[PDB]
Write a protein that binds this ligand. Sequence first.
Ligand SMILES: CC(=O)SCCNC(=O)CCNC(=O)[C@H](O)C(C)(C)COP(=O)(O)OP(=O)(O)OC[C@H]1O[C@@H](n2cnc3c(N)ncnc32)[C@H](O)[C@@H]1OP(=O)(O)O
Ligand SMILES: CC(=O)SCCNC(=O)CCNC(=O)[C@H](O)C(C)(C)COP(=O)(O)OP(=O)(O)OC[C@H]1O[C@@H](n2cnc3c(N)ncnc32)[C@H](O)[C@@H]1OP(=O)(O)O
Lengths: 161, 161
Amino acid sequence: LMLVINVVEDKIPANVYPELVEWVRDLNSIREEPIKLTMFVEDDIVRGIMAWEPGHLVYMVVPEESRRGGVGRFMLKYLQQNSDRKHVSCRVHPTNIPALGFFHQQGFQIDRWYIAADGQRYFRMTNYNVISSHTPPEEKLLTHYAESVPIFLSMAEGQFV
Amino acid sequence: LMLVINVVEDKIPANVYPELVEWVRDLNSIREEPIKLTMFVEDDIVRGIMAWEPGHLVYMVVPEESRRGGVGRFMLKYLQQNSDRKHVSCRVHPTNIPALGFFHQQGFQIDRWYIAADGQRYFRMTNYNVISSHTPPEEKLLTHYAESVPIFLSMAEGQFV
Ligand SMILES: CC(=O)SCCNC(=O)CCNC(=O)[C@H](O)C(C)(C)COP(=O)(O)OP(=O)(O)OC[C@H]1O[C@@H](n2cnc3c(N)ncnc32)[C@H](O)[C@@H]1OP(=O)(O)O
Ligand SMILES: CC(=O)SCCNC(=O)CCNC(=O)[C@H](O)C(C)(C)COP(=O)(O)OP(=O)(O)OC[C@H]1O[C@@H](n2cnc3c(N)ncnc32)[C@H](O)[C@@H]1OP(=O)(O)O
């Protein structure tokens, strides 16, 4: 029922959205095929907006009032269905741990890290399924001990102190 | 009301918990002061167990049935109150994104990354408050556009198709 509409980038009113027009132009200056800018609309609410191309997510945002409702999951699946082998790459700053949690829940893992030219740090997250996930052995050892060890300690303050 | 008890490491029954005894011994083989192993008990349930020393978290686990109840937050605060300047360091595998979300919510950030000798990757997370958090400018540009742009599209299937 949700409406999926693409933004005609050359018809974006530059007098109203100057910075957005510049950001989109700079993205397309290094590209043969132009980037896509897609909005996901319910009634009179833009539930989410996503800048993307087949196989790569540039940026996406769900406005705060629409979060934790599956909108982000819907946009990423729409991106995969328009992607070769449904494989997608993205970039996330290491401080954006909430976004890391979102992508991780969607089957993505950190497979590259680097420092950009201006000094910023970034992770690449993909769903290529090469990275192995590793659970340390001490987690099981501690869990079994915590559940199984006998404890005979009684102390509550009631009639005595 | 929760009981906080330290495990006497030399009295751990080696016949019952051989691997745990070995893991604790290997941790203490490179240490002057021995590690601490603390359990957090409610009634007959060990809500959480934590291997730690002042200023450094080695490992902690809340059993699945006790999670998302603040137990993990309670243990980390207990660790800070027994830490110089309440500063703590920890190590998290990059695939353990759920743990990254937990520590991030407690005021921690990734401040170091490395590859260990056996090939494993790790982040160091601290609450030292040196790392700056960075929100990209395009998040605001996309949010303002999504909320403000006029949209005159009407399409619902009712009396017409
Ligand atoms: C686009 C890039 O490459 S990086 C920049 C990412 N965008 C941003 O950071 C902008 C600010 N944040 C947002 O707009 C949104 O929070 C997004 C885009 C990250 C996710 O949008 P949402 O619609 O809220 O995600 P969605 O509702 O589909 O949640 C799916 C699962 O992802 C996980 N998840 C989502 N958000 C979070 C979070 N903040 N922390 C931890 N896990 C999360 C949860 O497991 C969630 O399932 P649940 O709600 O049942 O617990
Ligand atoms: C110890 C180290 O250095 S690394 C290894 C960490 N331990 C493990 O991975 C073992 C398996 N996991 C666990 O035992 C637990 O999930 C822990 C220890 C990570 C956290 O224990 P919990 O008691 O569940 O954490 P707690 O209830 O205090 O939650 C505090 C906040 O942290 C965040 N948080 C906690 N768990 C998660 C998660 N799985 N994903 C994203 N965010 C989380 C939430 O914001 C939560 O607040 P909320 O419940 O209101 O949403």
